[PDB]
Amino acid sequence: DEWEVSREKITLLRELGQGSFGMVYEGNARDIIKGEAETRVAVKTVNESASLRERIEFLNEASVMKGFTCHHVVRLLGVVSKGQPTLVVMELMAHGDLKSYLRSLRPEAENNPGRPPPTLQEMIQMAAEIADGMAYLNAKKFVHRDLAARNCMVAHDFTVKIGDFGMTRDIYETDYYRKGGKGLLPVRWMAPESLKDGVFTTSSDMWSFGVVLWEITSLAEQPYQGLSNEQVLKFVMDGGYLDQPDNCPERVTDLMRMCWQFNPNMRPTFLEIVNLLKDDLHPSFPEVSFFHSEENK
């Protein structure tokens, strides 16, 4: 209702790439944002051949997003749910996902924009933005379960935001989500206790946040390269973790190691990350952050 957008206002322009449950498109949306006759948007759709499970998860993801208002979380703008097909309209992120962005900054990248890799200050800013959006998600009582550079998105001014919630689960009642069994899973990002007990908490998100820091400082190499998926499962459950990338600033190394404590109780919280980094950020941060907001209570 409040979210419903009239279909005639949405025009699909081109493919951005296959999302969790179907193709995402760049589009044009008329009269969706007050003050803009027409806005360039991202539009998520469901594959016609999607399984019942995927159709359910797609709709549930859109539904979860309705509850979020955070500068560091990709914004839901509207839904077209009258007639066919369902369109999920969101904030277009001008520089796409963080993994693509990082890979483009490699010296040998064919798509190098003519900029060097991120500086220490830029890395710190990314870290704080990611952590701020995650702290918001946690305060909203959801666990992300799939935090990774590929699921963070980069805006026109290079602000990083949490951007994909295909595995996100409500934890209001218990503070954890548990699910064992077989699955196509982001093994290289997962905490030892998630792999062992199938348990997902804000601490297991923190583990993945460490891996995101590793991605930032390695320009999104594959974690545990030379190990198969099954070897990563064994390695990490037995107390293994990632080595430091070449020329990694010590400050980021220090954070990574805290994120990879075997015992989840020992890892930092996302608020603690923002707090640690808070004096080293762009002056706009307190004006837009969840951390510095009245809601952070």
Binding site: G19, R150, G180, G183, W189
Partner: peptide
């Protein structure tokens, strides 16, 4: 928006 199929593996957890 780029998908990364190699970032997932068929494993068993829990």
């Amino acid at each position: 928006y780029n998908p990364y199929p190699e970032d997932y593996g068929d494993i068993e957890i829990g």
